[PDB]
């Protein structure tokens, strides 16, 4: 409802950063190490 909706998109990744660049740098290390057995990659909203 703002005339430039960049913060409201980038807060919830309508249009923000990619799914591997905003996270804390341990969690990208965690989610790729636990790739086969405990996959948590479907909870982080890769935007297009």
């Amino acid at each position: 409802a703002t005339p430039s909706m960049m913060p409201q998109w980038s807060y919830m990744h309508i249009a923000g950063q990619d799914a591997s660049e905003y996270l804390s740098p341990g969690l990208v290390q965690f989610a790729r190490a636990t790739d086969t057995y405990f996959s948590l990659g479907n909870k982080f909203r890769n935007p297009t």
Binding site: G16, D18, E21, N46, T48
Partner: peptide, 29 residues
């Protein structure tokens, strides 16, 4: 760079593989 043409997944543009530039479709190839 031509980064303003690719449909970006997020901030990184979607740049394809290197076999997506030619073709070698012959009968038995």
């Amino acid at each position: 760079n031509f980064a303003s043409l690719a449909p970006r997944h997020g901030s990184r543009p979607f740049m394809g593989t290197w076999n997506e530039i030619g073709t070698s479709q012959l009968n038995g190839g």
